[PDB]
Nucleic acid binder design. Structure first.
Lengths: 87, 56, 100, 34, 115, 271
RNA sequence: AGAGUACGGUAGAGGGUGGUGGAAUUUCCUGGAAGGAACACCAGUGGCGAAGGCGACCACCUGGACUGAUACUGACACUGAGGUGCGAAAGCGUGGGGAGCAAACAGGAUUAGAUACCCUGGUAGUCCACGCCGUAAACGAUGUCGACUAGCCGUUGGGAUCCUUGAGAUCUUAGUGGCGCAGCUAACGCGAUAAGUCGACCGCCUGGGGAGUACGGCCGCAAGGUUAAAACUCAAAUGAAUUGACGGGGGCCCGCACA
């Protein structure tokens, strides 16, 4: 998984009436942080496709959570596409 | 409680005289720990508490 | 983290376990590791032939560093010293004592 | 014993014929008393 | 040469019999086979051969004594329990068996299941 | 290892071995000397080895086969190309100036190594007497007389395995496949030689032979009866002789070792 | 409410890298030295993964579900032609290894003959790194997903109820099995893991041969694979089930059938 220090760290800018861990600030961008740091083990273990099928499972679900923000909230979408180093 | 290989005379009650381990069909121990005993068996067997052949 | 040490000696070598242990005890305190058990086994007999002898002695300690006191903890005795066929078997909490 | 080696497709011809007998022994004995 | 103690192999495979008698450190004193007493062919896949193949090294281990022996066991086939009860008839008081049957964990695979 | 594209009819089969961590020019000048070509020719001026002539100008590198500095640690400066052999050479800088060349082992770039009476074995590249090298370990650059320097197992990727030990001698299996008793006073270097992908390169074209100083082989069935025993004949004949040299020695199977003064040193022949 | 995440806790041959092993067997030699390969028991109508698949010991970087709840999202949903990855082993690449067996064979014994099973021998291969093939009795010969309609007996992981000492019942779930009604089925049989009642969607079928074959396209170094026809030809091929017969099918029994 992610680091025990980190998975409780990254929520500190996702707060937005802080008790939310459910809006797509969290399941995009905890999950975007899952994308950006678990690249490491692939370089050593390139013969195990079980771990990047989870990557494509949630980067679609991130894009699915981008897809609902296409219509529900375009303005807070700019906080996602403008930030995080996307695209 | 939490079983290991430091308590020898508990595991030696299941250690065969011919050096082997017993199944659950021979003596009654839990099948929950039958997958955990044999791993702790081969740590006493690896740290030379139990033989590999029944000669020496 | 919690890291359960077992390493072997040759029975003609055990006159300097009092020098073997003390270097590891300062290999851990450079990195803030708390030692919760320091054991010296019984001089027991062997069940198989290891280096074609018929006697040995066992050592037990418990390292609680993070990461840095592992690769030297291996390679002092993995490369060249009197230790053979160990297992490093990390734990998750502390214990008190064994060997009765 | 180990004069021959068995093919790992026939390995479920040895055990899977026998693992039913482990269960079917419970079948015959419970139909024995009744 | 006057010794009183030793060990004893018996090879007990399916076709043939091999008997091997050594001392307790590993120097062979006597030996006989199922092609030892003049058979050479089709019959002696029997324990009757190991009845005969025991006593050609049972009156040949009476060259350097061996009042006591140590039976080591070897091989799967016949003649297993019908050969070490022939040596004790030949003036011996052999005590008890010891077994190292050839057992790998998986090992080299033999000629497989022939039909 | 690269395989060239067929932009011309000569590059179609050139498989090239290129190492990018080899040093880029200026070999170590106080440790080279002049070397002129023979053409395969005697001091009687006679061709005594055939098929030699031409090539590129080359300087001889004074590579140390003795490894005498004992106890002085040498750091490795760089690995260089050596025109004189198929292996690589490594420029070592000892702890008191003192550059030398050795034969480079596999896996060296700026590592530390010291030849002595009891040096570390884990580092591959440490030269050491064959008494205190552990049995079972692969070595290279084995001396054959103490003080003579390394003679055995020093081509590219060459090695020998130290297999047994008794007395003043030591037995080691050679890359040839033959067991060879060697004295244990004489040195050897732990490891295996560097350029082990040298057997993969293809020359590609007839010119690539000609600039290694190698010169064409007319085969003897193409000659006349006066030139070769594979005589003449009408059309393609097939050497009605048994196959034989241009001087009449039989070539397809006939043993030619006649040393006798070193046969006890060879415990088992090529099998 | 569906679906997702913040919090541990185990369970787990997930999977991969590097090592450390043992006995045989094999190969040497005077019990040692040497290296390959699969790891008896633990083994389970057990786990794990979408699937293919996967067990000595050991760390090391890493998956998805379960569950205990507590938090929050506000259908973000499932399915999905094309499209895109990923798929057992013999392979043939591009480099290595090397034990046993063994594809390739030589004879040995055998038959009209072995070109066969049996007998004496061995390279390719399995192994490794990257890469290609994308084949299947890939089978549970059962697409994925949700809902609901009597049960009963083991067994796997949690959790709570339980007089409680567990020798453990009950309950609760998510898996894995047995047997059975309602139910369906041509029957065999399935039977809350449906082969019922349904719903959304997808793939697929239209008599047997010709034929998964030609030709054309695509991929492969090749062997080939994938998509895929008609011309002709036959009135039948096929499915489960039943009676009889047969069997170098088993099991009992009878008779000078065996002395």
């Amino acid at each position: 998984a992610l680091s025990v220090e980190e998975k409780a760290q990254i929520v500190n800018e996702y707060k937005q009436a802080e008790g939310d861990t459910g809006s797509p600030e969290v399941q995009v961008a905890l999950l975007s942080a899952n994308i950006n740091k678990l690249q490491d083990h692939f370089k050593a273990n390139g013969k195990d496709h079980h771990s990047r099928r989870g990557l494509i499972r949630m980067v679609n679900q991130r894009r699915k959570l981008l897809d609902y923000l296409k219509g529900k909230d375009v303005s807070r979408y700019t906080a996602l596409i403008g930030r995080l180093g996307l695209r | 409680k939490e079983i290991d290989y430091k308590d020898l005379n508990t595991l030696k009650a299941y250690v065969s005289e011919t050096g082997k381990i017993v199944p659950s069909r021979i003596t009654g121990t839990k099948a929950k720990y039958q997958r955990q005993l044999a791993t702790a068996i081969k740590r006493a067997r690896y740290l030379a508490l139990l033989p590999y052949t029944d000669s020496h | 983290r919690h890291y359960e040490i077992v390493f072997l000696v040759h029975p003609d070598q055990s006159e300097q376990v009092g020098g073997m242990v003390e270097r590891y005890t300062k290999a851990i305190e450079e990195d803030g590791g708390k030692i919760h058990r320091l054991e010296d086994w019984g001089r027991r007999q062997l069940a198989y032939a290891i280096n074609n002898v018929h006697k040995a002695h066992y050592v037990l300690m418990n390292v609680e560093c993070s990461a840095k006191a592992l690769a030297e903890l291996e390679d002092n005795f993995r490369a060249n010293d009197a230790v053979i066929r160990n297992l490093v078997m990390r734990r998750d909490e502390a214990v008190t004592e064994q060997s009765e | 014993s180990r004069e021959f080696y068995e093919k790992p497709t026939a390995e479920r011809r040895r055990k899977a014929a026998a693992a039913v007998k482990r269960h079917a022994k419970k079948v015959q004995r419970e139909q024995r008393r009744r | 040469k006057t010794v009183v103690d030793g060990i004893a192999h018996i090879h007990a495979s399916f076709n043939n019999t091999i008997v091997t008698i050594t001392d307790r450190q590993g120097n062979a004193l006597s030996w006989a086979t199922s092609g030892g007493s003049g058979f050479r062919g089709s019959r002696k896949s029997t324990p009757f051969a190991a009845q005969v193949a025991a006593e050609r090294a049972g009156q040949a281990a009476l060259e350097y004594g061996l009042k006591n022996l140590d039976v080591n066991v070897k091989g799967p086939g016949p003649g297993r329990e019908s050969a070490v009860r022939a040596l004790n008839a030949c003036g011996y008081k052999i005590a008890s068996i010891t077994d190292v049957t050839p057992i790998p964990h998986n090992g080299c695979r033999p000629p497989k299941k022939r039909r | 290892i690269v395989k060239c594209k067929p932009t011309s009819a000569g590059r179609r089969f050139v498989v090239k071995v290129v190492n990018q961590e080899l040093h880029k020019g200026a070999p170590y000048a106080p440790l080279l000397e002049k070397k002129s070509k023979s053409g395969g020719r005697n001091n009687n001026g006679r061709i005594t080895t055939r098929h030699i002539g031409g090539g590129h100008k080359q300087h001889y590198r004074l590579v140390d086969f003795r490894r005498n500095k004992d106890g002085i640690p040498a750091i490795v400066e760089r690995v260089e190309y050596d025109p004189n052999r198929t292996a690589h050479i490594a420029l070592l800088k000892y702890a008191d100036g003192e550059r030398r060349y050795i034969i480079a082992p596999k896996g060296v770039a700026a590592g530390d190594q010291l030849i002595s009476g009891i040096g570390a074995p884990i580092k591959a590249g440490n030269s050491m007497p064959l008494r205190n090298i552990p049995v079972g370990s692969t070595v290279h650059g084995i001396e054959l007389k103490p003080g003579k320097g390394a003679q055995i197992a020093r081509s590219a990727g060459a090695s020998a395995q130290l297999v047994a030990r008794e007395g003043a001698y030591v037995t080691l299996r050679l890359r040839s496949g033959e067991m060879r008793k060697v004295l244990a006073e004489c040195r050897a270097t732990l490891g295996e030689v560097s350029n082990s992908e040298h057997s993969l390169r293809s020359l590609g074209k007839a010119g690539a032979t000609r600039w290694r100083g190698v010169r064409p082989t007319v085969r003897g069935v193409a000659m006349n009866p006066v030139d070769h025993p594979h005589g003449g004949g009408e059309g393609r004949t097939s050497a009605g002789r048994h196959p034989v040299s241009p001087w009449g020695l039989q070539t397809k199977g006939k043993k030619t070792r006649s040393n006798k003064r070193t046969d006890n040193m060879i415990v088992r022949r090529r099998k």
